[PDB]
Amino acid sequence: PKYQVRWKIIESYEGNSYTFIDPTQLPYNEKWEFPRNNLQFGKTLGAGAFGKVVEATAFGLGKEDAVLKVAVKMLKSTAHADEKEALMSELKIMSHLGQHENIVNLLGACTHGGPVLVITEYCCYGDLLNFLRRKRPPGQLSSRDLLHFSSQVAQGMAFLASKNCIHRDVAARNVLLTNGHVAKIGDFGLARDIMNDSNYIVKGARLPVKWMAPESIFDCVYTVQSDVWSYGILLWEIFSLGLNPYPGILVNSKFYKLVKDGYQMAQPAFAPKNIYSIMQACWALEPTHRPTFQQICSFLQEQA
Ligand SMILES: N#Cc1c[nH]c(C(=O)Nc2ccc(C3CCNCC3)cc2C2=CCCCC2)n1
């Protein structure tokens, strides 16, 4: 029922990254501001219980006065106070993270004279899960390309981790493909029908339990290492060409016991053995035994 910002900046004891500030507690930085009516709406890309995302044309957006297609996030006109706060919080975090080639970047915002609108990159080929499902063989794509996708998502995640940013909803539905079929990770909950998505299970909240690390499920702890677990599930999605994780198994008491016992999905049909080894490493029960995203990146490179 509550919206529901997944991205989170955490505190940093070790690692190469140090957290000086909590961005949601300062901005909003006005350098992002964009004239409201230099936007013309188009088709609705998606919608849910809290808002929607619409394709649009932006007239003279960046420093180069150019026109381009963009995706505009926004809340229902019925949105309550807290949820507008959550939207501003997502805005502030995206602005704090900076730009990277394998995330869905912030391009601007309209915060004055009407409802808050968040302007982010338009990715022409849509989300990764759908694209996978349309490129199945009987029962276009290629093994090189799946390795490209895996690498590009790992790069985006290495970038987030370097900012001490946790995602907490890493999954194929949250990966987009843009020109050149380059993968970009983001969070598109706003555009999704969460209330009716069986992949999100009722708790406190609505949680993607099948993508979640053991320690997130039982201890409600979230670190970059827990994102690594989820990335392994994402890998399984890619190399199964878009099968639902744990096919046929419903989330209930027996599932929770399985994962806690050390159950791991079997090797996907289209996964090379060494890629499966990445998944297995990602699913180590002890969090400090999992790889980091940069170690995944270098292995995927060595394997290419
Ligand atoms: N929130 C958000 C956000 C940020 N960018 C986008 C975006 O670019 N989305 C899409 C762009 C193009 C297409 C095209 C439009 C029709 N042609 C096929 C792909 C589909 C989408 C999707 C919207 C909702 C989530 C799944 C992907 N959504």
Curated annotation (Swiss-Prot):
Domain annotation Protein kinase: ranges: 39-300
An example Gene Ontology CC term for this record: receptor complex
Induction remark: Up-regulated by glucocorticoids.
Membrane side Cytoplasmic: residue ranges: 1-304
Residues bound to ATP: 45-53, 73
Family: Belongs to the protein kinase superfamily. Tyr protein kinase family. CSF-1/PDGF receptor subfamily.
Domain notes from UniProt: The juxtamembrane domain functions as autoinhibitory region. Phosphorylation of tyrosine residues in this region leads to a conformation change and activation of the kinase.
Disease entry from the Swiss-Prot or TrEMBL record: Aberrant expression of CSF1 or CSF1R can promote cancer cell proliferation, invasion and formation of metastases. Overexpression of CSF1 or CSF1R is observed in a significant percentage of breast, ovarian, prostate, and endometrial cancers. Aberrant expression of CSF1 or CSF1R may play a role in inflammatory diseases, such as rheumatoid arthritis, glomerulonephritis, atherosclerosis, and allograft rejection.
Protein name: Macrophage colony-stimulating factor 1 receptor
Origin species: Homo sapiens
Residues of the full protein shown: 544 to 914 of 972
